[PDB]
Ligand binder design. Structure first.
Ligand SMILES: COC(=O)/C(C#N)=C1\SCC(=O)N1c1ccc(C(=O)Nc2ccc(C(C)(C)C)cc2)cc1
Ligand SMILES: Cc1cc2nc3c(=O)[nH]c(=O)nc-3n(C[C@H](O)[C@H](O)[C@H](O)COP(=O)(O)O)c2cc1C
Ligand SMILES: O=C(O)c1cc(=O)[nH]c(=O)[nH]1
Length: 365
């Protein structure tokens, strides 16, 4: 479209040039929360609907965690055309996160590096924010627009599992799904929660807390993993997920790797790398987890999606749904409709009746 070109070729390069990436993020959150967004001209077709996690999703393209950390822009994000919204990560207590600067744009790589460190308004603030629009959300959910909440842990916590359990109790009742994010690269020790008898201990506690919520307030629980896992870690996670009946996986978080070939001047900043360089690392991790789980565990695929092709690759690899984030700094909001339009076109071109028919299609080749 005309908006797609104007945003990618003019508005975003201008914004990028005037504002550092953190400031641009904050402005984006404000604009979105006010609905100051281009028209989402795209009308979701029936072919894009997916049923998974105990819900209808009008389209399979969601906003990944980290854009709306504190639940300030949820309605705006639906207005953008996302089929689902995930907020967070939210930590139990408020916390500032790392010192500034902590977000870096790598334009030559279509990538970003961030070390936010779980900056969060905390559970109580977010709880109240979601409660103010709880019924508005229940209507959205019923209409195929669900809400996920991603739960973190505070930097100085002495009991990680207890942080997550607090999150389940406070925000679980307000969410269609919860995410245990045990994959931020930017909280010391966090990704060690991805190992075995200990991941099983953590997840058992989170599920117990979830199962204690009243039925209408009982979310699905997903685990979000990194793209930097060993084969051993992957196998272990798949094992535990099956054993405990975790509802789904989010694959992947950002990478602590630095693929060969990055050009940006800021490539050696500490933090998680997102965007194009993560893309195929993420697709491959979807592929592997789909096979380890025998296609029985729904996957939300995320990392470097900026086109329909990138979305379809993840779906065919085993994702039921996809998310994006970093593409917005390069393309802006029009990327959402672009992705959806392109995905629909490809699905038709490859002889799929809808998204659902494409899920895991590469494993049946
Ligand atoms: C002066 O600013 C504007 O005009 C904005 C904004 N601001 C406008 S006019 C209509 C509109 O749609 N906008 C907008 C632009 C970009 C984003 C965005 O999502 N930006 C964005 C910024 C940074 C990142 C990271 C670097 C954190 C990944 C991601 C997205 C969202 C909204
Ligand atoms: C600036 C920034 C902040 C993020 N914060 C979070 C977070 O709080 N929790 C989380 O689970 N993921 C977070 N992510 C990871 C994204 O959810 C996503 O997994 C990753 O960026 C890959 O998708 P993308 O390439 O489309 O950005 C963040 C990513 C970025 C770029
Ligand atoms: O807050 C952050 O630093 C953050 C969290 C997360 O899960 N992933 C990420 O890339 N950054």
């Amino acid at each position: 479209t005309g908006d797609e070109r104007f945003y990618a070729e003019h508005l975003m390069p201008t914004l990028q040039g005037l504002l550092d990436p953190e400031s641009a993020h904050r402005l984006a959150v404000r604009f979105t929360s006010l609905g100051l967004l281009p028209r989402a001209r795209f009308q979701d077709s029936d072919m894009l609907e997916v049923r998974v996690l105990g819900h209808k999703f009008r389209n399979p393209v969601g906003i990944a965690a980290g854009f709306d950390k504190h639940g300030e822009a949820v309605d705006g994000l639906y207005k953008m055309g996302f089929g689902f919204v995930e907020i967070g990560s939210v930590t139990p207590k408020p916390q500032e996160g790392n010192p500034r600067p902590r977000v870096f744009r790598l334009p030559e790589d279509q990538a970003v590096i961030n070390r936010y460190g779980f900056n969060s308004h905390g559970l109580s603030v977010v709880e109240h924010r979601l409660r103010a629009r709880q019924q508005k959300q229940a209507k959205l959910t019923e209409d195929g627009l669900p809400l996920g909440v991603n739960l973190g842990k505070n930097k100085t916590s002495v009991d990680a599992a207890e942080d997550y359990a607090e999150g389940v109790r406070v925000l679980g009742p307000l969410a269609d799904y919860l995410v245990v994010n045990v994959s931020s690269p930017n909280t010391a020790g966090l990704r060690s929660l991805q190992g075995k008898a200990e991941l099983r201990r953590l997840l058992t506690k989170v599920l117990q807390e979830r199962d204690g919520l009243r039925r209408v307030h009982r979310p699905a629980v997903l685990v979000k993993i990194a793209p930097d896992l060993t084969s051993q870690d992957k196998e272990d996670i798949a094992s535990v997920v099956k054993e405990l009946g975790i509802d789904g996986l989010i694959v992947t978080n950002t990478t602590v790797s630095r693929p060969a070939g990055l050009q940006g001047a800021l490539r050696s900043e500490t933090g998680g790398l997102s965007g194009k360089p993560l893309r195929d690392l993420s697709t491959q991790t979807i592929r592997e987890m789909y096979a380890l789980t025998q296609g029985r565990v729904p996957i939300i695929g995320v990392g470097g999606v900026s086109s329909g092709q990138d979305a379809l690759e993840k779906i065919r690899a085993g994702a039921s749904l996809v998310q994006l984030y970093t593409a917005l700094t390069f393309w802006g909001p029009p990327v959402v409709g672009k992705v959806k339009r392109e995905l629909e076109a490809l699905l038709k071109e490859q002889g799929f009746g809808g998204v659902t028919d494409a899920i895991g299609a590469d494993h049946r080749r």
